[model samples]
Target: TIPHLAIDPFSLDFFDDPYPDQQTLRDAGPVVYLDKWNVYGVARYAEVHAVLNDPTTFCSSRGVGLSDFKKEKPWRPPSLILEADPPAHTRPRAVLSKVLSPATMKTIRDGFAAAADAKVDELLQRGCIDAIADLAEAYPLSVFPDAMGLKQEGREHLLPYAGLVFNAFGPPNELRQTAIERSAPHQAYVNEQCQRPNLAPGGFGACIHAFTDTGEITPDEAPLLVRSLLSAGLNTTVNGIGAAVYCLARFPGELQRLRSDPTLARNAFEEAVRFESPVQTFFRTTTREVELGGAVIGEGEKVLMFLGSANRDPRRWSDPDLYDITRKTSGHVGFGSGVHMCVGQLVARLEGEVMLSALARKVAAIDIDGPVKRRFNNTLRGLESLPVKLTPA
Candidate 1:
């Protein structure tokens, strides 16, 4: 018999504070079945890492969420890059891989650093700020669209559009329903912006579309791929930055450590990502009856991979819960692993590094100014409001 839990992992209460439940799932067994959703759950680092790497046995084509594509129709068309299996996923994956390669980061670095400096300058003047609204959300809203070559006017829809995408990955709860209803307009705007005409002449969106000329993907597929990029670009980065800032504020010694050695900005961000695990969980469907972590799972079963829990699994990481800026975060699943690993990671890291570098260079102390508010989502872990007082160096 499978070890089972009656917990509702997708609920607001769970999202608000998941470590205890996550530990319970891990401690219960390597694989535990959640009766609430009738799905198998994998919380330990070894199993989660193994599942991600062996996509042939545990495929993503059945949808990377609560819904199994084999059993039901997804709310929208599935992503070629995110939801498809190898042969179907290969071309689009290569295109996006090339588009977001480190070389692309080189072109955007100067502008991104300039924007970060400007933001830090502006934040220091106020002395007090909401890390989420003022920096996390604001910084990406300013730079990412420009990098994508999107028009300026309807950019506000990006976040809501992201909410719809991520929430849809969960059950049809109140959050998913509300996000769906609010996303209609936002979706339309994002969809329209994905077209070749709407994208800037030399932006990443246009680069994706260019693959069409080479016969790699169809014109129709180009916009969808661009849409995929739009869907993920902002939300994850925003939460990741928020998570890092929250960690630094709460752990002042680490903040001092960062200030003393600004070179640790990248490590600090990676440690925060490992510590907070922003993009917390995703579902993987079993391709065949397979044995994983001592459990025999059957075909088409939904297995929830607790990425956040895996990052903190004591079996894999020593001091797993502690936020240490200098820790070797080589294998954390915060950005995920395997073929389905986040396509936007290079971009996310650049943003985190630049933002933290700017903050470290300019601020002497990052103190919590007020009550921190948590943003509840079926899939993301981050702050809604992180009021903080920054002391300029």
Candidate 2:
């Protein structure tokens, strides 16, 4: 029998601090029934990875959110890529993949690093600023939008729009409701930016438009692909960086380890990702009868995979809770796993790597100077305010 949990994963209290409830969900069953949301959840690493890898058995279509696209009106048109599967998902993924391929990633590296260094220099001069706004949020917003060929004027909408999308994954509570309310103008602005005429020539967004010519994806499909980049791209790096800063601040020892070996910059970012996954709790609908953790899950059921929980699952990790920069952080699901894994992760990693590497070079110590605040969205985990004092190296 499946363990039924009355926990509301979407509740503000739950959202504020989720680890205890995450442990409960994982301990409840491999496939526990979330009574509050009426969905089955998989909180263990092996099972979450299994579900994400076998998209054939666990589909992304029909909506990955609480409101199934088949049964209810989507607050917006479904994301053709994020919400798609197989043949439908193939082309857009390929085009976006190419957009961020190693070769292309190289093109952006210098610019991203230059921006990271410049941002850090300025922040170091001030020495005390909200890491969320000054460094984490500021860094990505500076580089990524221009990389996408978007005009900088309305870029403020990017974060809120992405928040709206992630919040929609949960129920239509205020978490989702507020995002919906604030996203109207932002959504319209993003839609306009997705079009070719509004985009600067030779940027990733325009590159996505060129996909219409090769026929990999239709012209109509072009904007949403740009929308996919816009949606998945910004909040991820912002939160990932914020997570990194939070980790380093709390784990001064790890920051020292990073400063000792600058090469560990990449490793620190990966650990930060595993330690504090930005994109957490994604839902997948089961495609057939499947047995998991001694229970049978019937077809067409919603299974919420706890990425953050799974990343720290003791079953698969050694000293999982330790924020050691030296830990083998590979295979962690911070970026998700399998086919539908975060497509924008390469760019995100580049951002994390460059930013942390630069910080490692200059900042000597991280001290938590004041109160910390959490950004409450339905799905993505991040900071609203992180007060820190940076000692210059």
Candidate 3:
């Protein structure tokens, strides 16, 4: 017998802090229906992974948002890669995947490490910095734009623009409206940069345009493909880096451990991602009637998979709330799971490890000098600012 445990997706409290709601949904059943939005939620680890991996039944074409893709105004003509299913999603993903291959990653390795070291050196010289804007946001914004072949003009708008775009995935409330208004002026420039000739040599954007030349994807699809990278890349990594720095500051002993063993830098980033997931949730629409955890999900219902909640679910993790680097967190859904899992995740990992390693090497102790502020958004779990005082080793 299925229990009648109702959760509301649009509640202000749910957006502000969703851990409790996640637990409630997870405990209630594998599929809890949200009456407010008429959506089903896959709150636990197993069910969430299943939904993401089985795209045939849980189609992404309906859009990965609360609004049904079939009915609502389309979000940027559907993602060529991220929003695409197999076959259609296969070729383009394969083409772009070559650019991010392990060989390419190897090329960027030492450079990323060096870049991290340099940034840390600068922050340590000052002795105090807002870790979020100064270091976390700075690192990725520096590397990713150039790597993607985007020019420097209006680059400052990247973070805010990404925040709005992610929020627009949810209902069009104040959050969405405000972010849209904030990003209006920069949209034209962003659109212009998606052209084939504008992309920098050897960047992902260039590789995408190359796909256009090969006829794997239409030329018109080139900009949208690049837009996918822009849409998914920025805020998640920036907030993730911020969360990593904040985690270390809050847990000074952990910082000591990381300093003692630099190999732990990557693990430290994963732990931070697990503890404070930068991407809180993504929606998947159910194609047909499905049974999960004893509840029957009706056809065409949106299933909100709470990745942040699953990361901390006590059923899956010991001391689920605590941030610990030593634990085995392999299956955690920070970058999501299955075929649609984050393609640029390794890039994000490299960025976090590089930047954090640099900081740990230069600074003996990192402490919070003021209160950390959270940047409120519908999709991204982000930090607005984190001021810290670093003592040189």
Candidate 4:
């Protein structure tokens, strides 16, 4: 039996800005039953982190959505790596982990920086542009496809396609329906790129295919792995850059801090991620009865870990909502926790640092001109547009 709350967990207002509702959920208890979804939600930092790290107790094999994996209709195959438990998740993760090692990330650092800088320069030349569309979306779209060895013929569809996939993780509502309709035409092209011969040499996709050749993964499983990367990668970065810029604009003092000390860009990026977690929430299924913060969660219940909420938990930080660059945000769940933590975080950091550093080097004062549009997706807290006036340095 769960206590009744006046809140509707699935409401659009909750998705648009979740902190108030998050606070309500946390105050209610560590594990509150969501009357709307009939699922359990873990909103506090401590409990969320515990659930994320304790995979054995809170299994992800149920596919990390509202649905359990034991059900017949799974949204897609469980994420080969992110949604699997240990032992079963080890091999595929090891194979992909090798491809995304620190050494490989270091090798791509200069290129990623250069690509970001060039995109910023292009955007700056326009003087005033939608930061989200022109710079945020443009930069990652330029680099990721080439890095994946994907061709340009139909590569423009990546972001929209990825947005649809992320939206699909939730219930089949209007948002999901709209995304499905938008993605219908591009699905075939995306599927075509998953073929071994279609991917270029020295790309991530090629490496995934090589794993297939070694019999580590079935040829059939190869594309799904690539699909996972494609699904998880694109929109998050685009929206992240937008969110970072929006934060900078909101906290003019933080922008001044970055301007004076450009190296702070890295810490600032991490801080921004902590302040406004881009990937807001993720789902985990309780494997057995587990007690968290003195609350018992039943077996097979869906648990929603609010990473954004946890990042701003008043108990964890001095000033939880303030966007200060000086804060030590290393413990934040912005990149998640444990083995399922985002493997591509360094890549995202490098991209963000490059863009931020370049902007700081070129601009003196920045101010927003129009309303910042918020894009609603079930899992990701993202910005749709940010109009800005940049005073060049």
lDDT of each: 0.92, 0.89, 0.81, 0.81
The whole-model C-alpha lDDT of candidate 3 against the native structure comes to: 0.81
Best by TM-score: 1
Model 4 clash pairs? Answer: none
Report lDDT (Cα) of residue 95, candidate 3. 65
TM-score of model 1 vs. true structure: 0.99
**What is the per-residue lDDT of model 4 for residues 30-92, given as tens digits with 9 covering 90 to 100?**
777777777888888999999988999888888776667786466455678877899878878
TM-score winner, 1 or 2: 1
TM-score of 4: 0.95
Error of 1 at 152 (Å): 0.5
In model 1, the runs with Cα more than 4 Å from the true position are none
Question: What tens-digit string does per-residue lDDT give for candidate 1 at 92-208?
Answer: 988999899989999999999899989999999999999999999999988999999999999988998998888899988999989987877997898899889999987999999
Q: Write the per-residue lDDT of candidate 2 for residues 232-334, one digit (tens) a residue.
A: 8999899999999999998998899898898999889999999999988888888899887788999888888899999989999998888988898889998
lDDT of 3 by residue, 208-302 (tens): 78777676778888888788788788888898899888888888889998888888889899999999988888998878997766677778888
Best-fitting candidate, measured by lDDT?
Answer: 1
- lDDT, candidate 4, equals 0.81
Worst 10 residues of 3 by lDDT: 1-10
